[PDB]
A = this chain, B = another copy of it.
């Protein structure tokens, strides 16, 4: 409706601004000839339907951003950059990378207050920035679509999704190790 359109305006504006802003971190690393910790960024406003069920703001993810990085070690590099930012205040961090969810989902969550300027004045909202690897984004994107297309998965499907997440993670670890073993195979001998 129009009432929901009005309530979500500031979250829609914030996702827009934060996408541009987080994408510009990457451009800043490349322009100064350095590895960008950030590969790409996406975001959306929670669809009306998903919001409605989940309430008894402290609904943290109405505005959601997804920051993809190549390696697990890049995650902390991005969290530090977010700490140095003057346009947001970090309210909450959750390390679901070191400690995964039961489904297999892995991600680092940073919840921020973000203020948006409107013609009706400043509006401060919460936004959730999810940092994850390419491998975790591969898994989460597919898991998310299969879910949205289903409804709750049979147990056997849920297990198979868990297994593919487990292997996607071993892949991140191994790619982390290849990167290390390259630079080590130059740095120490």
Name A's B-contacting residues (CB within 8 A): 5-6, 9, 13, 16-17, 20-21, 24-25, 28-29, 31-32, 81, 84-87, 115, 117-119, 121-122
Contact = CB atoms under 8 A, between A and B. Distances in A.
A145 to B, nearest CB: 30
A84 B117 contact: yes
Nearest to A117: B85
B13 A24 contact: yes
Q: How many copies does the complex hold?
A: 2
20 contacts: A9-B31, A13-B28, A16-B20, A16-B24, A17-B21, A20-B20, A25-B119, A28-B118, A28-B119, A32-B119, A81-B119, A84-B117, A84-B119, A84-B122, A85-B122, A86-B115, A86-B117, A87-B87, A87-B115, A87-B117
Nearest to A86: B122
Contacts of A86: 115, 117, 122
Contacts of A31: 5, 9
Contacts of A9: 28, 31
